[PDB]
Amino acid sequence: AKQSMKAREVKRVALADKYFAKRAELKAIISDVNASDEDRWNAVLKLQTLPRDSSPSRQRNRCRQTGRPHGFLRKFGLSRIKVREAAMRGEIPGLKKASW
Amino acid sequence: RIRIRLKAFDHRLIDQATAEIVETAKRTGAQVRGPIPLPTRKERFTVLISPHVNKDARDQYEIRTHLRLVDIVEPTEKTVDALMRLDLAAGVDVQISL
Amino acid sequence: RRRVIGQRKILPDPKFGSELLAKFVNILMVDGKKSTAESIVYSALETLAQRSGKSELEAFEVALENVRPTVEVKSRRVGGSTYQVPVEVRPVRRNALAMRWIVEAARKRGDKSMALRLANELSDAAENKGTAVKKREDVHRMAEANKAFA
Amino acid sequence: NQYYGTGRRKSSAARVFIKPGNGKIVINQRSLEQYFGRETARMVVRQPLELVDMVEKLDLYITVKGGGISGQAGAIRHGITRALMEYDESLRSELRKAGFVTRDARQVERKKVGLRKARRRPQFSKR
Amino acid sequence: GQKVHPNGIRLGIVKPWNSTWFANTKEFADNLDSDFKVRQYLTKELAKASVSRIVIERPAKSIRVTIHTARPGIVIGKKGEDVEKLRKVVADIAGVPAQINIAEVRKPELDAKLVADSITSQLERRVMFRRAMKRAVQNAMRLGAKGIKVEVSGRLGGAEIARTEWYREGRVPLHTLRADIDYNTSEAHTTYGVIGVKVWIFKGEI
RNA sequence: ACUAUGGUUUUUAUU
RNA sequence: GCGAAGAACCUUACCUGGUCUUGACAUCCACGGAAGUUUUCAGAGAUGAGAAUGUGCCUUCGGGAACCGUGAGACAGGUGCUGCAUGGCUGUCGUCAGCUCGUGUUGUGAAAUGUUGGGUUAAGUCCCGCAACGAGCGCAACCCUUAUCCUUUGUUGCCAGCGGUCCGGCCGGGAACUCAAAGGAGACUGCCAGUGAUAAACUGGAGGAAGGUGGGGAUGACGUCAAGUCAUCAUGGCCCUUACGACCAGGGCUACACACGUGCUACAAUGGCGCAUACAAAGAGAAGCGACCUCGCGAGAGCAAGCGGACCUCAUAAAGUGCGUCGUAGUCCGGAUUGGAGUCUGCAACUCGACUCCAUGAAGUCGGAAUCGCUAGUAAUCGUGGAUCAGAAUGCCACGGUG
């Protein structure tokens, strides 16, 4: 694998912060003509339709020691192919061994 | 009026923390209900056994998350004022509710 | 090899009675529903007692007297010589082998109802009228000559 | 004289208690008529004990939880036979002719790595 | 078949984890990410200071990192108070205020990691390491070992040729889980290869 | 009682 | 369904067209700017041009750090070549009883002996007797799990006895039972009878909840194929440089003559249909799991409580039971390519994705030679959750009933 991901992360985390992560509940009022008489949504709709690159699609987070598409342990943040020297040596709290 | 929670990943460490709670909150006022053990949320944590070309075997680890409520009945905020200051060693989480 | 665990001794039943009747309600069990054979055990006999035998008390005795294997056949070799060889069967389970040959045919034949698929099989078994038994006998008859060895 | 015993089998857990009195049976605090089974009543508690007589001059109390309902009957039979096997020196060995005083130890055997469900050995089949 | 880690089988037996703290699973991944970062931030800040092991304690609004060394003097540093660079390096990355905590290693010439480091410092120079292996074995049986083993294997040139070298005394029971046996690997990272060394030390059962 | 055939060259340390 | 937990885009190796040259990305040595925000046109986009806007940190105010950008050479970079090349990682003989060495012995030496030979076993296991006598790795044991007895504390888990009580642990109370976790105890071939150089060691019995490495796991002795893997992670040398590098957009992977691997649903009638009716168990979960209740044939979409989880919610146990009904038929059962309208994520499902409702409808009558897998809660059989994840799996990982 290549070390190509940070050159995308640096533009795509901000793309998400500006055009995704704080734009989800907006969908429940942006198109409603009964919920507003003030003109407030037309202009931010024209802004929200500007980006065309990634956010929910074309972009996966990938592991940190290698940008592999899979093997990321969701509630731990580590790759299952770069964890054995820590896991075996008792470096993750609460995991026990051996035989059960 | 108020109640507490204690969490850990080990049976002997949560006892070693219970020994501090009874000494920190349950002597003045003197509180007599003993500690129930509660479920440990037993589960296997699993990953592929080898980093290359094997997907057939998995490495087995034992996970437990222990809970103690210890029980308090004195309504005063003074019941927890020292427990929110004293040890309580590293490896456990305490919580004050209501 | 030689070990192998010791083969089982089965059981009787406090309602179905004998070890063979307790086998009848447990053999050829498929889908595990375990309530189907207790309406088919000793329930095909009242018509058998007026088709291929007499009484509900002897209708199944005679079926396992007409279906009676006395010899098995198997290949045997000794170096560069091979024979089909006949061997006498052991008596203690002999009637349970005969039972199996009836209850399986009610499954392997699919004609009308299950209230017929066994009763229609038993009425030929109580007469030794099984499928293709002339060519079955033609093997044991051919193997008889090999009890004289080489 | 009064008798007591406990018993388990495949997620079923039972207890049985026995008193002198008139032949009455209670199961899960209600009279035996308020119970349902797909086979005939009072058999699994009587037939293993006709060597000393049962349920005619004795007052019964039974509790059962968990598992299949004919597995519950097995657990009750283990409980009531273990409750009374002390009644005579030979009764401990007369109950082994049926085998009900031996415990049915069935309770999910632990998984082997890398094998699917309990101990079942690997299969590679063709070639 | 198998052999996935020489210590992964034994290191739960009467041994607390190398990091101690609690976090709810919905808070845990960033709490663990920071736990690897405090090791990495230490290993970029502290070098040659005779450190064998470090242990992580993260109690409420606090972090403590036990540093085990043969030379407390070269970790505590200049005038016994050159600790602030070594204390504060973990504080901003862990998100909690940091304390300093040092420990002295019991029999450093009978500890497999520090014996390996003495050999690695001579493998990274390709001279005197074979003498250091021989002497580590001679001395361990007089320090308190019931057996000792070392190994260097593969290439070390120069020439393409492959060579193994050990020196060995007594016993090294790996599979006896009451053996209480010490094991460590070390690597030299040279312009002539990775150049690893393996060290085993046995002091006695229980 | 299944068995005839099968082209070339082949690896570790030494003063 | 191997390298690879999801093939619209993305992944992905490949192809094409654009474009960049000390390079997307690094150090070295120099020279400027904070990091960077806002906005319009052009371009498939990468970008190419403009127009607004910001001045954070440390400063002795000299300049600088992180960071951005641009250079002159050394160079950077490579899903390029190779594990007959190296570090690492695996596949396999192997839970088999094996592997190896010292001292004496034999031999002109390679080598032998020990490890043989008699008893015994799962066993290089123990004992005996030999020119052999000893020692270590593997074995066997230490670790871990389980049927059983004892013990500890009682909410969100339980209730025998005792007082009250539509007669619900609910309220006084309480661990006989259950649940929760832990710590102790029980089993040892010990006891007996036989068998056996009364040796070393088997067979059978009693008592027991449990009987003979206790039952079951963890394991993996040197070597072998001089095996695979550089594309899981590192890396040498050769090779590529206005590029074989890497920034993007459009295309490839269900492109077709058929074969080969592995699975799914049927061919039923102990089944199909109609109708009535019962019990879960384990898991996950706050722009969540979403009750009760609506709206839509229905996928779904709304309104709106409980609860941050032994609590509330997802949520409904199916098989079965029992009465009618059809009746081995290429159709009655079975469901593929259809005909029509709907449900949904997302930039977007025409082409490569899933779901639903109402008609239609092909194959399918247990399978070629041949060859593959086993043993009690196992095979078969029927219910549930969860991981991966913008969206989708009969796959993967767990729970339970009928057996």
Question: Which residues of chain B have a Cβ shorter than 8 Å from any chain D Cβ?
Answer: 49, 56-58, 60
The answer to whether A98 touches E12, Cβ cutoff 8 Å, is: yes
- Nearest by CB to B63, from A81, A95, A98: name it: A95
Buried b (16+ CB within 10 A) or exposed e, C82-112: ebeebeeeeeeeebeebbeebbebbeeeeee
Element (H, E) at A95: strand A95-96
| Cα–Cα distance measured from residue C19 to residue D82, given in angstroms and rounded to the nearest whole number | 27
Which residue is closest to G262 in terms of CA–C1' distance? D126
Q: Give the closest-approach CA distance of B47 to chain D in angstroms.
A: 11
Radius of gyration of chain B (CA): 18
Q: Which of A79, A83, A57 is nearest to A70 (CA)?
A: A79
Note every long-range contact of D67-70, with CB atoms under 8 Å and residues 24 or more positions apart, other chains counting. D67/D9, D67/D10, D67/D11, D67/D12, D68/D10, D68/D11, D68/D12, D69/D37, D69/D38, D70/D38, D70/D39
Give the span between the Cα atoms of E196 and C108, in whole angstroms: 68
Q: Are D3 and D18 in contact (CB under 8 A)?
A: yes
Q: How far is B94 from chain A (nearest CA, A)?
A: 16
Say how far A11 CA is from G47 C1', in Å. 16
Rounded to a whole number of angstroms, the distance from the CA of A13 to the nearest CA of chain B is 29
Task: Please tell me which residue of chain A has the smallest CA distance to B64.
Answer: A94
Q: Which residue in B9, B44, B62 is closest to A93 by CB distance?
A: B9
Disruptive mutation site among D112, D113, D123 for chain B (greatest number of B CBs within 10 Å)? D113
Residues in chain B within 8 Å Cβ distance of D113: 49, 57-58, 60
Q: Give the amino acid at C26.
A: N
CA of E2 to C1' of G262 (A): 27
Beta strands in C1-146, from DSSP E residues, in sequence order:
71-77, 82-88
Within 10 A of E156 (CB to CB), how many other CB atoms are there? 19
* Contact (Cβ atoms closer than 8 angstroms) between residue E85 and residue E78: no
CA atom of E115 to C1′ atom of G267, Å? 74
Q: Out of A80, A93, A96, name the one closest to residue B61 (CB).
A: A96
Residue D76, phi then psi, degrees to nearest 5: -65, -45
Which nt has its C1' nearest the CA of B12?
G182
CA distance B97 to C24: 65
Q: How far apart are CA C85 and CA C77, in angstroms?
A: 10
Torsion angle of C-alpha atoms A35, A39, A42, A44, degrees rounded to 10: -90
Q: Which two tokens stand for residue D98?
A: 């049926």
Tell whether A75 lies on the interface with E, counting CB pairs under 8 A: yes
**Helix/strand/coil percent split, chain C, to 5:** 40, 10, 50
Q: Does A99 touch chain E (CB under 8 A)?
A: no
Report the SS3 class of residue E198. Answer: strand
Protein residues with beta carbon less than 7 Å from any atom of strand F:
C 77, 79-82; E 161-164
Q: CA C32 → C1' G339, Å?
A: 42
| Chains C and B make contact, 3+ CB pairs within 8 Å | no
CB atoms within 10 A of CB B83: 19
Distance CA C74, CA C83 (A): 8
D30 and D23 in contact (C-beta within 8 Å)? no
Measured CA to CA, the distance from residue A31 to residue E63 in angstroms comes to 50
Which of E167-189 are b and which e, b meaning 16 or more Cβ less than 10 Å from the residue's Cβ?
Answer: beeebbbbeeeebebbbbebebe
Kindly list the partner chains of chain A, i.e. chains with 3 or more CB atom pairs below 8 Å.
B, E
- Report in angstroms the alpha-carbon separations of E178 from C49, D122, E175, E181, E203: 75, 32, 9, 8, 11
Burial state string for D44-76 with b = 16 or more CB within 10 A and e = fewer than 16:
bbbebbeeeebbeebbbbbbbeebeeebbbbbb
Identify whether the C-beta of residue A16 lies closer than 8 Å to the C-beta of residue A55: yes
Cross-strand pairs, B66: B8
Contacts of A78 in chain B (CB under 8 A): none
As given in the structure block, the two tokens for residue D42 are 């009072």
> Is E4 in the B-facing interface, judged by CB distances under 8 Å?
yes
Burial class (CB in 10 A: 0-12, 13-18, 19+), E53: middle
- CA B89 to chain E, closest CA, distance in angstroms equals 6
Question: Sign of dihedral through CA atoms C78, C80, C86, C90?
Answer: positive
Chains C and E touch (3+ CB pairs under 8 A): no
Query: Are B91 and E20 in contact (CB < 8 Å)?
Result: yes
CA distance C54 to B41: 66
Q: How far apart (Å, rounded) are the C-alpha atoms in residues B92 and E20? A: 8
**CB nearest E30 (choices: A77, A86, A93):** A77
Rounded Cα distance between C89 and C99, Å, is 15
Q: What is the sign, positive or negative, of the torsion defined by CA atoms of D45, D50, D54, D55?
A: positive
Q: How far apart are CA D34 and CA D26, in angstroms?
A: 9
Two tokens, residue E195: 């150049």
CA distance D123 to A63: 34
Q: Residue A17 in 3-state DSSP?
A: helix
Is B53 part of the contact surface with chain E (CB cutoff 8 Å)? no
The pairs formed by E75-84 with CB atoms below 8 angstroms and a separation of 24 or more are E75/E46, E75/E49, E75/E50, E75/E51, E75/E102, E76/E102
* Residues of chain B contacting residue A87, judged by C-beta atoms under 8 Å apart: 47, 59, 61
Q: Which residues of chain E lie closer than 8 angstroms to A80, CB-CB?
A: none
Q: Given strand B3-8, what is the order of strands in its sheet?
A: B66-68, B3-8, B93-97
In terms of residues, how long is chain D? 127
Cα–Cα distances in Å, from A51 out to A10, A11, A54, C17? 16, 12, 8, 81
Euclidean distance between CA atoms C138 and E153, whole angstroms: 73
Would you call A50 exposed, middle or buried from its count of C-beta atoms within 10 A (0-12, 13-18, 19+)?
A: exposed
Q: E strands, chain C, where? A: 71-77, 82-88
* Residue in chain E lying closest to B8 (CA): E22
| C-beta atoms of B47 and A93 within 8 A | no
Which of B5, B6, B9 is most worth mutating to test chain E (most E CB atoms within 10 A of its CB)?
A: B9
Give the number of other CB atoms < 10 A from CB of residue E146.
18
Chain D neighbours, 3+ Cβ pairs < 8 A: B
Nearest to B93 among E22, E57, E62 (CB): E22
Contact E77, E18 (CB under 8 A): no
